[PDB]
């Protein structure tokens, strides 16, 4: 019935920095609050049990500490497959409350986006629909423009772009942004051009080819 | 060596039932403080059902009267019982052991997506991105309803430099997605590049060979 205020709700740090994470409770729990650790699509995972005893198999990096309102997990060290969101949860009156969560991200150094093009199928032609492609792949930070040029005219609200969840090993984001458009209105323009803005480009890149 | 397995997950009509399985390994649920745990897509953990040792069962508000949670003891499987299924529902579901005193949730089942909506389901269509030093080809999981689709690359072997972005609802209703794979260029002519994706909604399984162009 305590409800649990997590600090901060995001984190992005360097590998090899100390991580510290808070959880406040608005009403005493002694000593009755858990640790876990959730990965994109995966089940979560214990971490810490009455508030400092570290659970079966977790590494040395991870620990915990409290008693009362103020609670505290910590990563001594920080590592690339530490990229997850982290949960507080407080087991003394009913219900059973959980905490919202804090985000950890990995602050990596720049790295500049690799352009792909990529030309709807003709499978794909058959249906009536043109779906164009384009990928920036492995780049950090995640902040990236993307424009879209069809005979060098700007396109408007016929794009959706999609990121990867941090990659665990080397940390930077994957970008998808697949502009859609009719079968007819992809063959009365002849050049289709990508053009992507990043901190790791000392110019934007344009990406294109002809129909 | 614990493993939970779970089933039951997928597509249901707001107003409807679903059942939910979740088979134990390593240690006796009739014993043991057993707990459905849900989560929202993009949200927090939302706790449902604790099964205590002696036989009480307690519910979280928003479930009660509408699920039970039960186990059997001989099958050593555990099940949760839906009913009045509405969109707030929908959500991964997750059997995970709770620890009376001040202990753990130290084992979890590797989750099983429900979906509550009434929209019909759609089998994805699959395009290939063709690709033309490194190489970048892939698969285009285009107008599917609902999440998720599995996709995977050589019948799960070329599982290295696999890019599978999370999907996009489109406005017309349907979901789409890409699913990238960046391989050494001199294999283009021996080693052919497949796509396998499976939809288990519609039950549709295609399996498409990307080829230069």
């Known amino acids: 019935e305590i409800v649990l205020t997590q600090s901060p709700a995001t984190l992005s740090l360097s590998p090899g920095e100390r991580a510290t994470l808070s959880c406040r409770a608005s009403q005493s729990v002694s000593s009755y609050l858990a640790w876990y650790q959730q990965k994109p699509g995966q089940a979560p995972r214990l971490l810490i049990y009455?508030?400092?005893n570290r659970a079966t198999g977790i590494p040395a990096r991870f620990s915990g500490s409290g008693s009362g309102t103020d609670f505290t997990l910590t990563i001594s060290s920080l590592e690339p497959e530490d990229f997850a969101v982290y949960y507080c949860?407080?087991?003394?009156?009913?219900?059973?409350?959980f905490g919202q969560g804090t985000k950890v991200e990995i602050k990596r150094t720049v790295a500049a986006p690799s352009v792909f093009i990529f030309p709807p199928s003709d499978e794909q032609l058959k249906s009536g629909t043109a779906s164009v492609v384009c990928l920036l792949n492995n780049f950090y930070p995640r902040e990236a423009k993307v424009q879209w040029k069809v005979d060098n005219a700007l396109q408007s609200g016929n794009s959706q772009e999609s990121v990867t969840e941090q990659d665990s090993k080397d940390s930077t984001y994957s970008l998808s942004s697949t502009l859609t458009l009719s079968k007819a209105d992809y063959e009365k323009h002849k050049v289709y051009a990508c053009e992507v803005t990043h901190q790791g480009l000392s110019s934007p890149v344009t990406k294109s080819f002809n129909r | 060596e614990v493993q939970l397995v779970e089933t039951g997950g997928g597509l249901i009509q707001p107003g409807g039932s679903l059942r939910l399985s979740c088979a134990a390994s390593?240690?006796?649920?009739?014993?043991?403080?057993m707990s459905w745990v849900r989560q929202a897509p993009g949200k927090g953990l939302e706790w449902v059902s604790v099964i205590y040792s002696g036989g009480s069962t307690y519910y979280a508000d928003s479930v009660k009267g509408r699920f039970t949670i039960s186990r059997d003891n001989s099958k050593n499987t555990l099940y949760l019982q839906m009913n009045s299924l509405r969109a707030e529902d929908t959500a991964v579901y997750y059997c995970a052991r709770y620890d009376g005193i001040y202990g753990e949730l130290d084992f979890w089942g590797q989750g099983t997506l429900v979906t509550v909506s009434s929209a019909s389901t759609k089998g994805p269509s699959v395009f290939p991105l063709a690709p033309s030093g490194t190489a970048a080809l892939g698969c285009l999981v285009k107008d599917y309803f609902p999440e998720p689709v599995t996709v995977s690359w050589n019948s799960g072997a070329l599982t290295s430099g696999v890019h599978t972005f999370p999907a996009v609802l489109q406005s017309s209703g349907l979901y789409s997605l890409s699913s990238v794979v960046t391989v050494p260029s001199s294999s283009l002519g021996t080693q052919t590049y497949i796509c396998n994706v499976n939809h288990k909604p519609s039950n549709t399984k295609v399996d498409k060979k990307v080829e230069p162009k």
């Open positions: 390593g240690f006796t649920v009739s014993s043991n403080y």
């Open positions: 949860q407080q087991r003394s009156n009913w219900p059973l409350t």
């Open positions: 009455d508030a400092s």
